[PDB]
């Protein structure tokens, strides 16, 4: 398994694989990811931090951008309050075991040279393109603000300005990233992680939608959220419990079941779990019990560091 | 005639008259106008500079904003080239007899505090409103850029930032000004000048449309432009020659005519010229001859200073 294959594991796409391979040869290489600060850090965040850890293990210097100014532009509140949530997020990311440097967008995004660049990019970016790039990111607003279209060019210049080789984000960032690869002289390698389904199955997981498991949820809370989650027998597509099994659990996985329902089941890969679930050899209740118990153990060290 | 009435003369609107009156009482008061730098300075510019002179005579400190960064956002070229045209414009404005201070937008519009203000305003300004405010200003573009909607909030913050009591501009600026009066804590008094008709009568006069008389046009050039201008008998509405008579000429005005066509005509006011023209007592050819000759004399001192 290449460093390349370790990095590629469980990503949705890498733009491009050829470019990443060229990057991997260098002694010194950096990757960054930006997050609008979030009151709760959930499995979606953890999925991406896990990927940053993969990159770190492959010798990348990791930068976490606490995106206070973008969050401000996306109507998340006042900068001072946003920064405080950013600081909390840093502590959570540290509790996850990430070795990284942290920067606040506003530390450099209001510099004269940065701003001049933003305006230069604004001349090359159509309103239609800017709005399209924000469809999965923009806060819902019946009267869309000028701030909405400044946000994507702020993010485009961010990669350029700080000289990152690799930008990581969820699939929802991909249009902004495509714009960056088009507009900037140096092409940034983009690694996109899948977007987790919300627990009720009705859309994507999000801090604003209350459809997530937070990394510091209590065990009792995790069990309840999983008990109630969308998880139709035989259905893997859009099944958040199966997603958790794929992205977070380790294998071989032992699934405990009463003897009357077939007894304990040892599963050597997610792929084999998927076949058992599609073939209805594994019931949603037994899948859920195992996912809840293993996820609790996975998250325990993080919750404990945050509780201590 | 009040200072108020001197200021009001030949304006399209003042927002608001009550506010201007409060302003007039102060010992210290300033007014500014901004211009995207223009390769040619035309009668539209001169009309507004004349109004700045009125304000100066009423005891206002005048600031001319050479709007290099707005011009950049509105696709007028590179900043360095734009600034050079700005410097030329300053020399023309000085040749007009204006006593003012001149500043380049970019001297202060890229400051961290300015930019933070721009982003705060971007949160309060809808895209729909920003685009509407730019309809008569925005460079024609089949694929409108993000830069187009940054421009109006740049101009909104300009008035606020430099603490002007009064902003002057053409009617085309009125939506941006309305936005400023809505968004800022201090209401700026806005004085709007009429927009001159193009020489061919087919739209408004503009540097980009080649339908103007420039202040340094040669006498021969002025005569030719006027000879060819739209000027229907009896029609005052949208008649650029009648506009020049109203906004630039002094009265009493003597109109020279051959005896066979009624002989020389002395006109004591624009209002009386308008009645004679509507009643068809004054032929377009005779009106044009007088307007051309008087406009040449009006502009001679400006052209001469620029030629020297
Ligand atoms: N768009 C990201 C945040 C972000 C990512 C990368 C960035 O470079 C920046 N930025 O420049 O402020 C911001 C999000 O949805 O959470
Ligand atoms: N909109 C003006 C230029 C302008 C006027 C006033 C201003 O404050 C600024 N500005 O802030 O750059 C720019 C024009 O059409 O020529
Ligand atoms: Na080496
Ligand atoms: Na006094």
From Swiss-Prot, chains A, B:
Coiled-coil regions, chain positions: none
Effect of residue 107 to T: Confers specificity for the non-natural amino acid O-methyl-tyrosine
Protein name: Tyrosine--tRNA ligase
Name of the gene: tyrS
Gene3D superfamilies named among the record's database cross-references: HUPs, Tyrosyl-Transfer RNA Synthetase
Family indicated by similarity: Belongs to the class-I aminoacyl-tRNA synthetase family. TyrS type 3 subfamily.
UniProt-listed InterPro entries: aa-tRNA-synth_I_CS (IPR001412), aa-tRNA-synth_Ic (IPR002305), Rossmann-like_a/b/a_fold (IPR014729), Tyr-tRNA-ligase (IPR002307), Tyr-tRNA-ligase_3 (IPR023684), Tyr-tRNA-ligase_arc/euk-type (IPR023617), Tyr-tRNA_synthase (IPR050489)
Sites where the protein binds L-tyrosine: 32, 36, 173
Subunit structure of this chain's protein: Homodimer.
Binding site for ATP: 207
Originating organism: Methanocaldococcus jannaschii (strain ATCC 43067 / DSM 2661 / JAL-1 / JCM 10045 / NBRC 100440) (Methanococcus jannaschii)
Keywords: Aminoacyl-tRNA synthetase, ATP-binding, Cytoplasm, Ligase, Nucleotide-binding, Protein biosynthesis
Lineage: Archaea, Methanobacteriati, Methanobacteriota, Methanomada group, Methanococci
A single MF term (Gene Ontology): tyrosine-tRNA ligase activity
């Amino acid at each position: 398994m290449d460093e390349f294959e370790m990095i590629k594991r469980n990503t949705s796409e890498i733009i491009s694989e050829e470019e990443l391979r060229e990057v991997l040869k260098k002694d010194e290489k950096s990757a960054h990811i930006g997050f609008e600060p979030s009151g709760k850090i959930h499995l979606g965040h953890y999925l991406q931090i896990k990927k940053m850890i993969d990159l770190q293990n492959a010798g990348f210097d990791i930068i976490i951008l606490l995106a206070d100014l973008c969050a401000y532009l996306n109507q998340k509140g006042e900068l001072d309050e946003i920064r405080k949530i950013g600081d909390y997020n840093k502590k959570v990311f540290e509790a996850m075991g990430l070795k990284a440097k942290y920067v606040y967008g506003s530390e450099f995004q209001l510099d004269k040279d940065y701003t001049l660049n933003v305006y230069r990019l604004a001349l090359k970016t159509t309103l239609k393109r800017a709005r399209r790039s924000m469809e999965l990111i923009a806060r819902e607003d019946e009267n869309p603000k000028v701030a909405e279209v400044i946000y994507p060019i702020m993010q485009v210049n961010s990669a350029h300005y700080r000289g990152v080789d690799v930008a990581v984000g969820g699939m929802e960032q991909r249009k902004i990233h495509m714009l960056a690869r088009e507009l900037l002289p140096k092409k940034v390698v983009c690694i996109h992680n899948p977007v987790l389904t919300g627990l009720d199955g009705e859309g994507k997981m999000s801090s604003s939608k209350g459809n997530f498991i937070a990394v510091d949820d209590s065990p009792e809370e995790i069990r309840a959220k999983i008990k109630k989650a969308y998880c139709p027998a035989g259905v893997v597509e859009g099944n958040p419990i199966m997603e958790i099994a794929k992205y977070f659990l380790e294998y071989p996985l032992t699934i405990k079941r009463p003897e009357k329902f077939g007894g304990d089941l040892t599963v050597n890969s997610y792929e084999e779990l998927e076949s058992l679930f599609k073939n209805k050899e594994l019931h949603p209740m037994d899948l859920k019990n195992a996912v809840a118990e293993e996820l609790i153990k996975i998250l325990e060290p993080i919750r404990k560091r945050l509780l201590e």
